[PDB]
């Protein structure tokens, strides 16, 4: 989890993915 993304703007609806979680370390 020492990568990711904050920015994509939180909303709720389909307005953004998620970008937290160990997955970006790949």
Request: one cysteine or more; proline letters at 8%.
């Amino acid at each position: 989890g020492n990568d990711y993304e904050d920015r994509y703007y939180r909303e709720n609806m389909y307005r953004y993915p998620n970008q937290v979680y160990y997955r970006p370390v790949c």
